[PDB]
Amino acid sequence: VLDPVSIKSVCGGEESYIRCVEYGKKKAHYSNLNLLAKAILAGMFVGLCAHASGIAGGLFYYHKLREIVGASMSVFVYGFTFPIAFMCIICTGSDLFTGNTLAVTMALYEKKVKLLDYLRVMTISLFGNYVGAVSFAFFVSYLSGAFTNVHAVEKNHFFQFLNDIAEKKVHHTFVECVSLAVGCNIFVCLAVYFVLTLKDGAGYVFSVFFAVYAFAIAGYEHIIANIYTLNIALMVNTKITVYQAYIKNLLPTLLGNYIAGAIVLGLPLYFIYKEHYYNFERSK
Amino acid sequence: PVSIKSVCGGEESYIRCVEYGKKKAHYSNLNLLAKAILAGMFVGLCAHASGIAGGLFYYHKLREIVGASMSVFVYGFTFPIAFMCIICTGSDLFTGNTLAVTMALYEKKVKLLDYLRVMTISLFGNYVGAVSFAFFVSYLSGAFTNVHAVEKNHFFQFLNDIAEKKVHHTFVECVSLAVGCNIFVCLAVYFVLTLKDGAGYVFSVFFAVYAFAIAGYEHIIANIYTLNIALMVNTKITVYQAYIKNLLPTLLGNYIAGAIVLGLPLYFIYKEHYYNFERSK
Amino acid sequence: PVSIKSVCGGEESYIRCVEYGKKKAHYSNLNLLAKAILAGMFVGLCAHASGIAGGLFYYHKLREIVGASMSVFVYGFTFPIAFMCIICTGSDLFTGNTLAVTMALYEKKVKLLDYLRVMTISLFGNYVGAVSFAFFVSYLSGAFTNVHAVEKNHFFQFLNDIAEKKVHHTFVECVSLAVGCNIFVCLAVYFVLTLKDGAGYVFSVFFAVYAFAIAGYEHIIANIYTLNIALMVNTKITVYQAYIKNLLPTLLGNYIAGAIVLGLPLYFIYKEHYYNFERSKRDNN
Amino acid sequence: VLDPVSIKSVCGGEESYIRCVEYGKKKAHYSNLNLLAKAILAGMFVGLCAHASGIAGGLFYYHKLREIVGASMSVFVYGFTFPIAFMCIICTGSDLFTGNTLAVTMALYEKKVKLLDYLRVMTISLFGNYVGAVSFAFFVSYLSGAFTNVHAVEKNHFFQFLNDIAEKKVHHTFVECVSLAVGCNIFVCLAVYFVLTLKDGAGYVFSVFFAVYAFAIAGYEHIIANIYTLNIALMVNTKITVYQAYIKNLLPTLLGNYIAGAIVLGLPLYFIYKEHYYNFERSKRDNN
Amino acid sequence: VLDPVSIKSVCGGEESYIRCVEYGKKKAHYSNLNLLAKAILAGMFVGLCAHASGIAGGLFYYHKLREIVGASMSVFVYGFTFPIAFMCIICTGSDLFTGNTLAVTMALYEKKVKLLDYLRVMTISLFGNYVGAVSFAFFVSYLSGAFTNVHAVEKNHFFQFLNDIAEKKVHHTFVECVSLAVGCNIFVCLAVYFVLTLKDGAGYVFSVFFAVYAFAIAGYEHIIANIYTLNIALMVNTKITVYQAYIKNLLPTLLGNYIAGAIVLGLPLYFIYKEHYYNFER
Ligand SMILES: COc1ccc2c(c1)O[C@@](O)(C(F)(F)C(F)(F)F)CC2=O
Ligand SMILES: COc1ccc2c(c1)O[C@@](O)(C(F)(F)C(F)(F)F)CC2=O
Ligand SMILES: COc1ccc2c(c1)O[C@@](O)(C(F)(F)C(F)(F)F)CC2=O
Numbered sequence A: 001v002l003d004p005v006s007i008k009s010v011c012g013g014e015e016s017y018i019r020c021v022e023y024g025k026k027k028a029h030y031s032n033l034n035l036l037a038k039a040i041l042a043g044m045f046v047g048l049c050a051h052a053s054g055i056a057g058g059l060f061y062y063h064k065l066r067e068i069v070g071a072s073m074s075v076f077v078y079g080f081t082f083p084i085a086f087m088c089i090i091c092t093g094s095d096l097f098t099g100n101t102l103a104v105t106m107a108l109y110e111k112k113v114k115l116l117d118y119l120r121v122m123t124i125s126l127f128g129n130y131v132g133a134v135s136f137a138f139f140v141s142y143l144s145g146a147f148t149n150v151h152a153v154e155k156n157h158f159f160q161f162l163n164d165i166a167e168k169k170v171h172h173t174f175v176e177c178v179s180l181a182v183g184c185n186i187f188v189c190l191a192v193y194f195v196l197t198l199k200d201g202a203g204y205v206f207s208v209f210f211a212v213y214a215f216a217i218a219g220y221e222h223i224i225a226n227i228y229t230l231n232i233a234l235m236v237n238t239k240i241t242v243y244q245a246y247i248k249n250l251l252p253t254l255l256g257n258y259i260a261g262a263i264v265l266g267l268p269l270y271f272i273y274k275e276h277y278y279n280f281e282r283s284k
Numbered sequence B: 001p002v003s004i005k006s007v008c009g010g011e012e013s014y015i016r017c018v019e020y021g022k023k024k025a026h027y028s029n030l031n032l033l034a035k036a037i038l039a040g041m042f043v044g045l046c047a048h049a050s051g052i053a054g055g056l057f058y059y060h061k062l063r064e065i066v067g068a069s070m071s072v073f074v075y076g077f078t079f080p081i082a083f084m085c086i087i088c089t090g091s092d093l094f095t096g097n098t099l100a101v102t103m104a105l106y107e108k109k110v111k112l113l114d115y116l117r118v119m120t121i122s123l124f125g126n127y128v129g130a131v132s133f134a135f136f137v138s139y140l141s142g143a144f145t146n147v148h149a150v151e152k153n154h155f156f157q158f159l160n161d162i163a164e165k166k167v168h169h170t171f172v173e174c175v176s177l178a179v180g181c182n183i184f185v186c187l188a189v190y191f192v193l194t195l196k197d198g199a200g201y202v203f204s205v206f207f208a209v210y211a212f213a214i215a216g217y218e219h220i221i222a223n224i225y226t227l228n229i230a231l232m233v234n235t236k237i238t239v240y241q242a243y244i245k246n247l248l249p250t251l252l253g254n255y256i257a258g259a260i261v262l263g264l265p266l267y268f269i270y271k272e273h274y275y276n277f278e279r280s281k
Numbered sequence C: 001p002v003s004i005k006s007v008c009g010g011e012e013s014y015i016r017c018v019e020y021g022k023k024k025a026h027y028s029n030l031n032l033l034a035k036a037i038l039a040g041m042f043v044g045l046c047a048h049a050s051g052i053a054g055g056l057f058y059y060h061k062l063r064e065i066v067g068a069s070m071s072v073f074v075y076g077f078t079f080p081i082a083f084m085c086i087i088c089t090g091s092d093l094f095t096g097n098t099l100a101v102t103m104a105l106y107e108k109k110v111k112l113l114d115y116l117r118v119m120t121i122s123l124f125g126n127y128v129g130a131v132s133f134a135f136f137v138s139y140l141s142g143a144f145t146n147v148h149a150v151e152k153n154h155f156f157q158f159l160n161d162i163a164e165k166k167v168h169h170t171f172v173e174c175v176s177l178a179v180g181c182n183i184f185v186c187l188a189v190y191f192v193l194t195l196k197d198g199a200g201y202v203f204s205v206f207f208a209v210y211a212f213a214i215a216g217y218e219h220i221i222a223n224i225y226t227l228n229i230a231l232m233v234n235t236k237i238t239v240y241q242a243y244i245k246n247l248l249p250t251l252l253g254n255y256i257a258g259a260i261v262l263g264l265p266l267y268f269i270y271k272e273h274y275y276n277f278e279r280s281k282r283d284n285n
Numbered sequence D: 001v002l003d004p005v006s007i008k009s010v011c012g013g014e015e016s017y018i019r020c021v022e023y024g025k026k027k028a029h030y031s032n033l034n035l036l037a038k039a040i041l042a043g044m045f046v047g048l049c050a051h052a053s054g055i056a057g058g059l060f061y062y063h064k065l066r067e068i069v070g071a072s073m074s075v076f077v078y079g080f081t082f083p084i085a086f087m088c089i090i091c092t093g094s095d096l097f098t099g100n101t102l103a104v105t106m107a108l109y110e111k112k113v114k115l116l117d118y119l120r121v122m123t124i125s126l127f128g129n130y131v132g133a134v135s136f137a138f139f140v141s142y143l144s145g146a147f148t149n150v151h152a153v154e155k156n157h158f159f160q161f162l163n164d165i166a167e168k169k170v171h172h173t174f175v176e177c178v179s180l181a182v183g184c185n186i187f188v189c190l191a192v193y194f195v196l197t198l199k200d201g202a203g204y205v206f207s208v209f210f211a212v213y214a215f216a217i218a219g220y221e222h223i224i225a226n227i228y229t230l231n232i233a234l235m236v237n238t239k240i241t242v243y244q245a246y247i248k249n250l251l252p253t254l255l256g257n258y259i260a261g262a263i264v265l266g267l268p269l270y271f272i273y274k275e276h277y278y279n280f281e282r283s284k285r286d287n288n
Numbered sequence E: 001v002l003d004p005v006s007i008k009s010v011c012g013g014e015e016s017y018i019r020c021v022e023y024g025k026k027k028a029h030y031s032n033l034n035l036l037a038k039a040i041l042a043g044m045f046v047g048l049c050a051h052a053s054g055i056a057g058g059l060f061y062y063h064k065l066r067e068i069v070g071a072s073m074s075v076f077v078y079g080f081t082f083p084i085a086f087m088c089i090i091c092t093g094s095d096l097f098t099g100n101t102l103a104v105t106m107a108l109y110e111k112k113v114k115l116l117d118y119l120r121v122m123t124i125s126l127f128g129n130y131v132g133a134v135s136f137a138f139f140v141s142y143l144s145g146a147f148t149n150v151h152a153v154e155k156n157h158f159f160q161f162l163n164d165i166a167e168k169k170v171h172h173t174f175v176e177c178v179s180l181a182v183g184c185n186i187f188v189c190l191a192v193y194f195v196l197t198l199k200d201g202a203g204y205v206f207s208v209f210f211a212v213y214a215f216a217i218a219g220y221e222h223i224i225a226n227i228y229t230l231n232i233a234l235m236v237n238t239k240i241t242v243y244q245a246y247i248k249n250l251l252p253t254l255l256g257n258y259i260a261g262a263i264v265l266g267l268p269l270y271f272i273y274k275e276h277y278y279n280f281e282r
């Protein structure tokens, strides 16, 4: 005989909802040092991919390439070489903050996690991610002399990129930074939701690539990425300060990101579902 | 290596389409609208991102020697993720629904009043979602302000020029472009049901949506979002130019393209395969 | 875990090809006609999109430097979705049919009268679909018309130039390009018959169609659509240079490319194996 | 309930060797005038894809595009639109020559095919590939009037691509030619290994695309490809000759491709997997 | 009636660690001489892909093209055509030291390999990869005259690129080469993790594609690839020195890669999954 058997991998929509709920749920039943270590590893990963993307962008940000291109090439290159951090953060079993919002709030609305454990888990995750991102920004990004200031305009195509992008991220307004943050985190949550319903290698890679590339080229603001880039911009002595980092950009970035995760995608999805989840709860 | 087959076409894709179509008549009027507004918010997300991405390539000195060639390409290349967000989420856009629920109606699965109410709730909710994302995320962040300069105002000018180009078509031209758009879109919604493969999923929908974007076709929800955010950011267009010159012809076109240009053909070809499938089952 | 596989190629591909050709014999006359017109308008839609993208990359100050490099490249990159459309919905083009139904006739799985019937029906339908879409969505949509300016006439200049370059071949040249085109097309059909997977389908045919587009070969229905819209929009050609000087050669080239270039050899190769398969299906039940 | 079953798309490692030796073993049973038809088809496919690649490159080889860029974009486009030939040959069951050296000499190494039969399969495959390649280069690529010289500066971008690429091929040395040849085959043979280990379509298309795109952009000399391009360049009356095409370049790349197929890689693989193939063959003694 | 099978091509997390440590353990029973053959094969494979990438990147290093882009397209094409070395190595079963560091050390940690076996396995891997890389850098690369100093500036790019690249693979100070090395190895070990835990051919190709491309375009430092690059740059008589080649890059690149493998991706991941593995092996 020669007849094959059918097969399918996109088993989702109303089941990826249950996968999200449980994945967020038993993320709480780990050890404090376990969450700590996963968070620090994810921060290191974000630092790595952001250094890589910055070097590529500053490569395409040459002196005579701006005079015509005007940062079209540089941003496209950054948005092309950044969307790989997701793979290293997922396949190593790590956990980042931006996706913890969606997952863990889903698991809390269903009353599977206690809200104190919610506090513990997500403060640990955010603190660890900051710790890892800044540790990488200093150990492998700054002692590597990559983004330093070479006072000649010919070679400075690396300093001016990490200077311009930073001082552009700073000078938004509170409202603007918040809206860009909510946009970024909605894209991030959607990329996280992809994985639970594709269950396909190419599905994984290409779906999250498209999502994160859209976020990156879009101009939205990610808290972990912002943490890394602004810390390193401070370390290589660009023209921003500490105030414009953890107040004028960072405070808004976290507020809007959490709003997008817990409120924008939280209550609509919880209203659609929670009555499809009931039957799955009834099962033995 | 046992031989596996991750594709079926023709008859079976039609069965899946008609079943997904007659499904949505059983949802409550609340979660249906909830789903519709989420689809709108996602198309707004992706349209905003792709718009700023295309405006990036619309530089003052690039436009001189490329003449908007690269901007439209990056728009088309950045948009097509919206398909993935909606299908994965469990939501629905009115364009996709057209083909689905009209095929069910033809089959005798959805009643008439249920058909009217599903499709109207879908259109209304999608408008709500698009026009609310247009304000709360894109107007407040100020990404499209008329930065009164020549070498910093590309994100405004790209949106301004595309929104102007989208209004000056005469009636029949807007109708025809919308017809083509919905043909593309319903073909993509068909691909998704035909091949149940993540790689095939993302790439089939990406190619379909890219060909739909770069071709100058008119999409009703994307038009809603873009034209609203071009009214907010104070470009050259009159409310009348956006809502009666553009939106009405493109809605005419999208519905017609989904319901009769590709619904009666596909229902006359496979009229009785569905009969037999329901017989022995 | 458990190991799997998708691509079952070689003999299995030939058996699938000959039986997928066989099947078309019994679809009623109305049934093939409908599917024909549908595939025609699909190829028309995708070609319209392709030409619009190409013209977009045909600006005034662009050709003054790069000539036509980006134009043809983006054209060929935008076209390949028509195959996915036709294979997903289940319609047929003449280009796909040549190989399939000749290979089906060779095994005497078909009749000759029904072979003539299915071929004529498919060609008539594809022509009707291509010209209907060329009139109703390309010329009423006034997208290719000649806005007599220089800096915004890309979408008429591109179409004018490709039509002019296609009508200007000697008989043997158009025939040669046509056989090249249909060779690529039926190899793509063989690809989807042997892959049985999603990404395989998509990218396999993408590369095949892109290669036959960028090369400048001659597809008969693509040429129907493009030359008929060029006649509508009134570029600088005539009815001759489309129907007689370009379309008869490409029709004959495509037919012989499907019928004899590949289809006479592969029959000779796997005749014994399909005989074995038929005898085995008769051995079991 | 939901519980998707885990699969594995690649059974690689110590097994692709078994599959490759089995493939090369079974290939040598077909018939005399059957291998002929398969080889002629493979040559036709190589010619088709090389013609498309040449047209694409010459397109991107415009006059002012040369003066700005320096003939870098045309090479990239050629390398991008070449790789389809592998899928053509694979799905149609046809076999090129370069593929055989890595497969059928490995088969013979284990003492599966006789010696005589090995030599005859080699010669039949190469003769058929040659005849098919030059048949396509005459009947579809010369009668097309595509690469015809124009005697004009802004339309000659196809003739110029063909001319200069051939003229850069011919000015090699024997040592240089054989080194470029061995590099190319090493690429081709690893692509064959790819195909016979990774299933699932994307492994069938993308791996081989990347491999032979590297082979194309890298400047490595391919035997069948060189056959096609130099024969058609001669047909079009470029600056190339008959002895700079056949003896000076064609023979060194032929010998180098064979060397890289049967000695560079194929001997170490055999040294590694002797025992694994022995313990594999240890099964059907009493398993059946 | 329609009823496909719910497939799942990817099963990662704890399974990834399980597979990586069992593979790192299994690679230490290889007869003391299969390891060397596989390592030399890996060396020649890296040489293959790096030669091809050098030619590709040099093609975009034109004189005139260089005046505008200034190396943006060169490095991009180089990184775009390098990453096939990963696939070509894994599909045959070779032995790469820089990737062996994580897998091989982890297995050491969990008491699956021993001290002397770990020692000798990785010294074999070192020597074999080096032999393969230098052999390929001489026989096929130096002999095919593709990199000679054709002293006309219009055609010399295939030399200049190589030259220029080597020129700025040396002049870092110590700690700078160490940091770039740490980053590169971290990348390649995560690529190994990817290719191990995502069991699909599609991901097989594309995960490692993105990983190695991002490693390459980022100016990081491999040790096998740097061995090939600097050897062949010596053979052509560019503006470098064997002392700068060895005591200024190789010394720094190998140390940094080893630190990135066995201490920054092997001690964390061993503190994470130390119990999930035990509860699995009994
Ligand atoms: C499933 O694992 C997660 C969970 C959450 C995130 C993640 C992975 O990856 C991000 O970092 C990213 F997608 F934005 C990246 F691309 F930058 F990596 C953001 C994020 O919240
Ligand atoms: C799976 O359900 C549907 C139903 C309908 C649509 C859809 C999904 O995806 C779209 O939204 C889209 F992604 F293709 C867009 F780009 F056009 F927005 C179009 C559309 O109408
Ligand atoms: C699988 O069934 C077929 C049957 C026939 C054809 C086909 C598929 O694919 C085409 O549509 C195409 F994609 F190659 C196009 F570009 F020419 F349109 C042409 C064609 O003959």
Ligand SMILES: COc1ccc2c(c1)O[C@@](O)(C(F)(F)C(F)(F)F)CC2=O
Binding pocket: D046, D083, D084, D085, D086, D087, D089, D090, D093, D094, D095, D096, D097, D098, D099, D100, D188, D191, D192, D212, D222
């Ligand atoms: C039957 O399977 C084979 C056998 C051998 C070859 C093949 C497939 O495909 C190639 O033609 C190629 F595509 F890799 C090319 F690019 F080198 F042409 C090389 C080659 O000899």
Ligand SMILES: COc1ccc2c(c1)O[C@@](O)(C(F)(F)C(F)(F)F)CC2=O
Binding pocket: E046, E082, E083, E084, E085, E086, E087, E089, E090, E096, E097, E098, E099, E100, E188, E189, E191, E192, E195, E212, E222, E224
């Ligand atoms: C699966 O087996 C391995 C093991 C290790 C590596 C590898 C494969 O692939 C590399 O060779 C590479 F591709 F990343 C290179 F390009 F950097 F060389 C490096 C590396 O560590």
